[PDB]
Amino acid sequence: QQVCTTQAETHPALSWSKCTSGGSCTTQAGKVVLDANWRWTHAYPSGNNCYNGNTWDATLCPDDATCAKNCCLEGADYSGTYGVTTSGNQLTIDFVTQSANKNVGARLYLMASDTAYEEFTLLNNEFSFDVDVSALPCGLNGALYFVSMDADGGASKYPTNLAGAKYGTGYCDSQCPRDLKFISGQANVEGWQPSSNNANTGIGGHGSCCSEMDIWEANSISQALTPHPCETVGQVTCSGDDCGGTYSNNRYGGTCDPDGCDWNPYRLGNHTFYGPGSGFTVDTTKKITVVTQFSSTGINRYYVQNGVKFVQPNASGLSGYTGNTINSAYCSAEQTAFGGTSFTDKGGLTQMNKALSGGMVLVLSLWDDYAANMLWLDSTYPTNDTASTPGAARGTCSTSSGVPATVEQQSPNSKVVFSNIKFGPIGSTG
Numbered sequence: 515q516q517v518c519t520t521q522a523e524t525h526p527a528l529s530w531s532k533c534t535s536g537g538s539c540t541t542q543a544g545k546v547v548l549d550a551n552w553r554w555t556h557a558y559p560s561g562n563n564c565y566n567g568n569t570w571d572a573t574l575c576p577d578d579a580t581c582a583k584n585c586c587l588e589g590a591d592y593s594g595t596y597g598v599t600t601s602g603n604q605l606t607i608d609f610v611t612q613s614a615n616k617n618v619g620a621r622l623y624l625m626a627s628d629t630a631y632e633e634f635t636l637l638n639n640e641f642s643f644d645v646d647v648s649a650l651p652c653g654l655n656g657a658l659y660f661v662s663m664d665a666d667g668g669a670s671k672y673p674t675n676l677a678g679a680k681y682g683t684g685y686c687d688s689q690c691p692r693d694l695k696f697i698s699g700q701a702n703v704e705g706w707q708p709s710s711n712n713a714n715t716g717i718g719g720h721g722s723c724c725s726e727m728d729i730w731e732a733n734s735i736s737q738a739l740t741p742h743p744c745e746t747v748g749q750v751t752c753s754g755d756d757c758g759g760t761y762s763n764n765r766y767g768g769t770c771d772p773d774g775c776d777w778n779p780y781r782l783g784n785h786t787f788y789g790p791g792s793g794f795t796v797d798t799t800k801k802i803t804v805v806t807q808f809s810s811t812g813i814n815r816y817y818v819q820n821g822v823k824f825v826q827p828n829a830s831g832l833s834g835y836t837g838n839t840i841n842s843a844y845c846s847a848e849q850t851a852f853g854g855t856s857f858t859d860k861g862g863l864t865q866m867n868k869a870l871s872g873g874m875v876l877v878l879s880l881w882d883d884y885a886a887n888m889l890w891l892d893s894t895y896p897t898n899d900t901a902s903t904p905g906a907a908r909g910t911c912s913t914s915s916g917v918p919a920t921v922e923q924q925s926p927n928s929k930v931v932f933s934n935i936k937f938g939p940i941g942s943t944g
């Protein structure tokens with residue numbers, strides 16, 4: 515895509531800490547950038563909208579290549595349109611923001627500079643952040659995660675991407691998402707189908723696949739930590755159903771693992787660890803520090819709240835696994851007990867570790883779920899199962915919760931607040 519400037523693009527500043535072996539940390543002057551899908555796209559250098567509602571303009575966009583030549587991305591009013599603000603080391607994302615239109619959430623990337631995403635190599639290192647999920651009810655997901663995106667958004671590979679990282683291009687993840695309007699310097703107009711339950715979204719003929727490490731997906735009720743490997747570490751474009759993922763006729767027919775080897779303490783039999791108020795070990799009405807440590811043998815986790823350190827609880831009642839670590843033994847035991855082969859079919863932790871040994875881009879988002887109402891995170895899922903089905907129970911939310919139109923109407927002032935990001939070798943951030 516091209517770049518237009520009737521709306522200025524200024525990336526909100528966000529401080530974070532880089533720590534070194536020995537525990538010295540120094541402040542990094544980062545910034546964040548809004549994903550290109552949230553932006554206004556119109557004719558370059560000026561003219562009609564290329565995309566409006568959930569359909570493309572056929573004249574401007576007769577094919578994928580011509581569309582990208584004819585259409586530009588605009589700048590973003592982060593606070594006024596998207597409900598995104600920063601202060602020092604703190605980032606806030608509001609759920610519903612009303613201005614010209616109703617905006618729902620956001621997806622943002624941490625930048626090293628105004629033209630480059632920050633690239634984190636996770637293996638042998640740890641990532642720490644603080645989060646306030648108190649204003650995230652059932653059906654919402656405040657997510658902090660990593661994907662194997664190109665640092666320049668693909669600009670050096672695809673000359674028709676003139677927008678680059680400055681405009682939040684180049685997203686990919688383990689779903690091989692097909693809802694993206696621009697992939698690898700081309701529009702996704704050919705075969706585009708509007709969503710039946712969402713006025714603003716659709717599904718195109720291509721998707722964008724890459725490795726993904728979901729450090730944090732959570733609301734005030736439930737949370738999960740999930741590696742997702744892909745057969746190719748970095749970005750690849752897929753076609754149609756061969757993308758796999760939720761919006762495809764065969765979920766597992768692609769090159770990424772859309773399920774992942776997930777660790778949700780509630781799903782793993784600990785129903786008192788995480789939740790609102792003093793009945794839980796980690797009280798979700800108050801700020802939580804979440805630390806995640808990556809090794810060739812596994813992923814370890816601890817929390818700090820009110821100055822008190824709590825390690826990840828052990829899996830409870832999982833046949834053949836007694837630890838608290840995402841390692842190959844856990845991922846196999848999980849598949850054996852709960853079902854599925856996707857994670858190991860796509861190369862498991864060995865393949866995940868290849869992505870963790872290269873640069874990954876930090877993604878911060880807030881979303882509601884137009885496929886499954888977030889029931890997979892915070893309720894019983896699938897709903898035709900009950901608590902007696904192994905792995906069915908993931909949280910205490912009602913099976914009727916999380917319908918997007920309902921949560922958007924009911925809880926529009928929901929928000930997530932991420933802060934105090936720290937990164938360095940294992941043991942260095944604490």
Ligand SMILES: *[C@@H]1O[C@H](CO)[C@@H](O)[C@H](O)[C@H]1NC(C)=O
Binds near residue numbers: 826827
């Ligand atoms: C849940 O985790 C807490 C904190 O680690 C622990 O004290 C408690 O025994 C765990 N519950 C079960 C059922 O294992």
Ligand SMILES: [Cl-]
Binds near residue numbers: 785
């Ligand atoms: Cl229980």
Ligand SMILES: [Cl-]
Binds near residue numbers: 785910
């Ligand atoms: Cl419970």
Ligand code: NI
Binds near residue numbers: 719720753
């Ligand atoms: Ni194609």
Ligand code: NI
Binds near residue numbers: 785
């Ligand atoms: Ni219980």
